[PDB]
Ligand binder design. Structure first.
Ligand SMILES: Nc1ncnc2c1ncn2[C@@H]1O[C@H](COP(=O)(O)OP(=O)(O)OP(=O)(O)O)[C@@H](O)[C@H]1O
Ligand SMILES: Nc1ncnc2c1ncn2[C@@H]1O[C@H](COP(=O)(O)OP(=O)(O)OP(=O)(O)O)[C@@H](O)[C@H]1O
Ligand SMILES: Nc1ncnc2c1ncn2[C@@H]1O[C@H](COP(=O)(O)OP(=O)(O)OP(=O)(O)O)[C@@H](O)[C@H]1O
Ligand SMILES: Nc1ncnc2c1ncn2[C@@H]1O[C@H](COP(=O)(O)OP(=O)(O)OP(=O)(O)O)[C@@H](O)[C@H]1O
Ligand SMILES: Nc1ncnc2c1ncn2[C@@H]1O[C@H](COP(=O)(O)OP(=O)(O)OP(=O)(O)O)[C@@H](O)[C@H]1O
Ligand SMILES: Nc1ncnc2c1ncn2[C@@H]1O[C@H](COP(=O)(O)OP(=O)(O)OP(=O)(O)O)[C@@H](O)[C@H]1O
Ligand SMILES: [Mg+2]
Ligand SMILES: [Mg+2]
Ligand SMILES: [Mg+2]
Ligand SMILES: [Mg+2]
Ligand SMILES: [Mg+2]
Ligand SMILES: [Mg+2]
Ligand SMILES: [Mg+2]
Ligand SMILES: [Mg+2]
Ligand SMILES: [Mg+2]
Lengths: 278, 278, 278, 278, 278, 278
């Protein structure tokens, strides 16, 4: 019916992967790389390209139907939005951190100057612990704030952890947020579900591999525990053996394959896939 | 028998894709990138690398057996050649165009200075309309010929259309030619058909994806209308459902997949393929 | 005496040029590109690498002695800081802009939704005009805010103007700010002046060329009006002619050279320089 | 049990492919590209990154369990090591070569100055022929040693052969060694076999494609001679035809496909695979 | 007065150097790289970007005032144009060439199939020798025309000569044309001379270095024979020695410097320059 | 007279800078990047491109006249060669190093397993200290030899020191060798001195800048102590001031310039130079 309005990051580390997913999903790409909008007349969707912080606000306020942004940003925004899908890129860990030497606990955070780019996120986490501290807002590069003499500890996005160790800092406590890129919606229904199914179909193509193997009937129980599938594993025969098909995660596939080999599975074969409509 | 003689573009936008297709087809690649020839002794084919305009002429005159070049160039050459295969890259649209503001029709072209790099193509198109105009031959960059004051309208290769809008020009009329890279032959037969089948097998691997899904017998009719296949869809069972396999175009696969989902299809799964011999 | 504390942008379009100027000025470069600090023990200066918005704040509050950031950011910060030097890169124009078709004036801005990443800058400019409007804060990509339906006009950083024309917007009014990268100070004195003189010496090496020419005594008056120099032009003899030396701006040197040729100057010769201590 | 110790080349043409195979095999990648070691605590393996010549020695002497290096290097090392797997990259041919014009035979090598980076390899090959010559050790660039006037012929690594022809040299005799990257072991058993199976599973994914086709029962015999498979070809039905599945080498697949087409095979379809556990 | 119209190559090996010279000369650069025109309102010149062959024609016919193109193209065009300036890039040698083995002379060209992209150039050269041959027009890649069996010898652009030797061809005879990029004019005068002087000033900055040295009065005669200068060498004193200044070619400067050292010159010092107005 | 024979590294970090110096010195560059030799017929010099270790040997043994290689390699070779020139690139520090925690001295090296790629260098350094240790030869990557359990300390090439700290190692003692690229000769004279003077002229152009300033006669003494020059500073007048010219090192120029400013110098101006013949 009415044209759907979808926002994607214009720039930075969440942009290229997001525009890759949208192109794989069949959506019309931008005519020039300096465009901040594109209209796809075949699929009836208008795309806007914005800074990630603004994406959460305008899904929240209803000016956009969907957005792609970081989970941590959403956690920090306090916008009226629900996470509709996890996108499998841009992943990071949000962590308390402080100077090395002392053994640090969450309890040590009391009465401290804490620097972060995500003040609402942090204020909310401190309230759940019952801790009063003074939270200092930076725009980024927050892990030099303690060498700069503006803070005692930090709360910051961590990827590898190289930046922390290169600056003599140790992460402590459980992560406040485990972040990855997410498709958000405000907290034309068929069209909305259609878009979600397209995007999910691509994500599943990126995250899962198809496994084919022959397994003994003897071992079938253990095998389905090892490979449950995204959908019900196809199972068919052939004297006492069976042939199996199941989507499995790409991350774990060698470990999965070794376990199957360890319970008598044979002719184990992994292959890529492109899209799902499950 | 006798060694086949095949020409490919030496340089420019039709070269790399053509040499990619030939390598995927198993043919011996060039030993140094500054070579204009290579002999493949295993497959009994000699390759020459030439400017695209010359490729059409020498297939025409019999010095080459096959060539790879642009359809628009062939349309313009007037060489004795038949298009044996379409190659799915280098695509473009050949268009009349003129300055914006006026509403333009093909009839407005009468008595006008028309600039183009493809004069024979254009002379032939004007004759079919019954229009007399004066056609001006440029070597390229033809869309500045009207700001230069040498022409009133143009006939030119269009891709995105950015160049036209950046120069205040609007395309009008139906395209004179829809171009893409093509394998040509002059208008040793088993060997010739063998080469065509290799090259086609690669092209099909690039253009189609394999779709697997379960469909209700109820819906089978509509489903085969949605997925006819390059070859007859494989269909087999399983109470009232069936399992299907069909090659479908890569361009349309998300749209195709949504339609199948809309008629009760399930476990729809798209995967790449590399080669066909159909 | 005490080690000076200097901040530079960590990332983005103001970073590489700033670190280039500091290396040319003899300062110790970063040991790893993921470092946010470096200490130069020979020159007695500690460098911090931060987000540009934060640079202005911490020079303002005294935690830093000097910073390198954008003039527009400083105009927007309202921090207690004076511009000590202009750095000749990162230049831009800050502009009101609105949809094309209407003829726009500053007076049209009254009662309007204005989107900008620089709200304080804009609030201050509107107060000087006597205009009440509603200023909307975005984080960036502000020129799609009117196609998005969140604003009537914008106030934004403009470089080429391509983004504005690609989105059907026209800049109007005088620029609110003409921006370039600047060395700031809070609004150890010998050491501070030493650092400024180093940095200025590099900037002058980038912006000026040395001109040597022979000029008639006849024409000397007009010539010194054309070439005043950064310092007093060196002038010496040689019957009735003189030989001149003067630093001139790199931007204008061909125009300057033509004017000198037009008043009888000869053997006009421009050459680069690397550093000044003037 | 005990952590396995595996060495890979740190740098050069055997490094990136080796680290690609290890990442595809699920092993933990290096945290920084200037690291010479990484410990994978999930899979219980420690990786070291060394110069290729040293890899063979320390597998030989027991300080490493496995190494990845070149076969020619191993042939030259005389270390106590067995080749456990061939890795399908870094391939080369080790060749005698001498100046063009004369017709060269292995017998001509007697009494000659032979330059090579692989003296033990060459001394051993000469002993098997019964030839006494004087072998000269270079560190590399050995094909200029004859223009330099330090040798009469050479024994050297050959890839394309461009370097030889560009220096007026002709390869002669059979290759002393046909080299490619190999996984070596000293000449915790379950863990060792597990690592080999992972690495082999990746290599097979790189070297083979899956072929699906329909074949007449008439032709089945010839077809299985054309496609024997890495594993037993799957064969099932369907009036008089059969459907086949067999892994075939990627290098030969178009030739293989043509032969099958020539014996009445139909719907021949090649597709990639990622991993095997056979 | 009237705006000057100047054409530059749009693409290929003569484009970037030409646009570099124009930017160094102070002229307004293109706003987007896909533009075929730019108007410089400060300097009162309009630039067009065209294919090199067309540049010569439209200077010839008066639609352009100046063009930048290759000398060989001009030699081939037969357009009414005079070479106003040589630009010191795009240099090449136009050569007859034929298969190796025979000793070739210009006289051998009689009665032969000669392939070339420059037929008028070649027809004119043959007429001056009194030779009748049949000249065959290709669009390029002409050095495979003899392996293709369409020609006995060629006339073609030669740079390094690698392409010729890689295809078993030897250049013979004197070059028909020694080519480099040139500024052409049709065969508003002050403005035209102004543009030429700007462009020449840049070219001289690229081709010459300033030499400063002390020379004995004894040796002055030999020294001025070694360094005549673009302009009169500046000469001044200082017991029996003199100090010299002279622009010399960049290509020969080490040879020049050695000769001066060989006649007792001292403190010889070469330095770059940027622009001349001589 | 006889053609000089000069060797340069074929590959790696000493190659590009060496071939840059030779091209700037006017010598004929390689026709194809896969060539191991080039003959310069104008300057009467033949160039060979070899592995750096072999360069030292063949200068030593007289097969080459000059070579370019690393000082540390020469120190290690024990070839009959004298360092004729230092080339100002490829610089490094050769260092003992061991695991962090203990305070290390040279005396601690006694009875230890020391790993190094430079065993002769190290054996010689230990003999001068009177220390017996066991030196272990690696081909490279030597700083993992202690985590590998093959050595207690190392002697290795150090650049930044990142590799050492990333592997928990501390450098100790004075450097055994301070290395940079060097022009070597065996320990046709005019031609040899000519080549050295060319190469030195380029190196000086890379390492020094020209300084011009006005200095008080008052301060002249201190000023010439600050700027002694590569050659005698030119000094001339002008009431009580003087004007100075002196080549100074590029590395120290801002420090030098500040000191001059501190003793009343004015109009201090640094500029590049290209070549010297001093
Ligand atoms: N190592 C990392 N450092 C910082 N952000 C990361 C990292 N890894 C992933 N991210 C994610 O990137 C997202 C933010 O993207 P980006 O940095 O482009 O936005 P921004 O911070 O608003 O812009 P900018 O960094 O240009 O100021 C966050 O959701 C964050 O979790
Ligand atoms: N946007 C485009 N502009 C021009 N040609 C295009 C475009 N897209 C596809 N093509 C195709 O490229 C082919 C011509 O290739 P190419 O431009 O390399 O040859 P050419 O014009 O003879 O060479 P050159 O452009 O170097 O003078 C034509 O068949 C044309 O349709
Ligand atoms: N075309 C342009 N667009 C945006 N900013 C520009 C442009 N040209 C120059 N700049 C300058 O860049 C500076 C801001 O740099 P930068 O964009 O890296 O900081 P930021 O906006 O805080 O970070 P980010 O863009 O990653 O969110 C400003 O002073 C601005 O004037
Ligand atoms: N064209 C080639 N030239 C040289 N080596 C090759 C070639 N092709 C493959 N190789 C392989 O590369 C391996 C050696 O790798 P590499 O050259 O990185 O080691 P190295 O010779 O010890 O190091 P370096 O070359 O840096 O001195 C050998 O097994 C060799 O067969
Ligand atoms: N090695 C070379 N090969 C071909 N042309 C060269 C070479 N070196 C210089 N040139 C010059 O380049 C100019 C032609 O440029 P260019 O090849 O871009 O034009 P074109 O031949 O019309 O276009 P295209 O090659 O795209 O068909 C000629 O003046 C020619 O002398
Ligand atoms: N950080 C560094 N690490 C190693 N060598 C360096 C470094 N910096 C400079 N060099 C110099 O490089 C020279 C050796 O060059 P190179 O590494 O190319 O030769 P090689 O070790 O024989 O070859 P390869 O490293 O390919 O086995 C030595 O003189 C060394 O001092
Ligand atoms: Mg930001
Ligand atoms: Mg960020
Ligand atoms: Mg062309
Ligand atoms: Mg073209
Ligand atoms: Mg910004
Ligand atoms: Mg080596
Ligand atoms: Mg090697
Ligand atoms: Mg050309
Ligand atoms: Mg090395």
């Amino acid at each position: 019916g009415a044209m759907l309005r979808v926002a994607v990051p214009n720039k930075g580390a969440l942009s290229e992967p997001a525009t890759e997913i949208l192109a794989e999903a069949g959506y019309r790409r931008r005519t020039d790389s300096k465009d901040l909008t594109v209209i796809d007349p075949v699929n009836n969707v208008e795309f806007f390209f914005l800074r990630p912080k603004d994406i959460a606000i305008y899904v929240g306020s209803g000016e956009l139907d969907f957005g792609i942004t970081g989970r941590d940003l959403v956690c920090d925004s306090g916008a009226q939005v629900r996470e509709r899908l996890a996108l499998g890129f841009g992943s990071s860990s949000f962590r308390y951190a402080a100077p090395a030497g002392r053994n640090w606990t969450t309890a040590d955070l009391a009465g401290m100057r804490i620097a972060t780019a995500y003040p609402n996120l942090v204020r909310k986490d401190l309230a759940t612990k019952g801790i009063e501290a003074t939270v200092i807002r930076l725009d980024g590069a927050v892990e030099i704030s303690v060498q700069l003499g503006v803070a005692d500890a930090i709360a910051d996005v961590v990827g590898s952890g190289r930046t922390l160790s290169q600056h003599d800092l140790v992460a402590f406590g459980e992560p406040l947020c485990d972040s990855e890129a997410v498709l958000i919606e405000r907290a034309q229904t068929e069209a909305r579900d259609q878009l979600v199914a397209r995007v999910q179909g691509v994500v599943f193509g990126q995250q899962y591999l198809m496994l084919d193997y022959d397994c003994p009937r003897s071992a079938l129980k253990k095998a389905t525990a090892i490979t449950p599938g995204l959908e019900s594993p196809t199972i068919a025969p052939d004297p006492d053996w069976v042939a199996i098909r199941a989507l499995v995660p790409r991350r774990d596939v060698n470990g999965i394959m070794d376990e199957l080999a360890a319970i008598g599975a044979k002719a184990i074969l992994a292959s890529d896939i492109r899209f799902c409509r499950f």
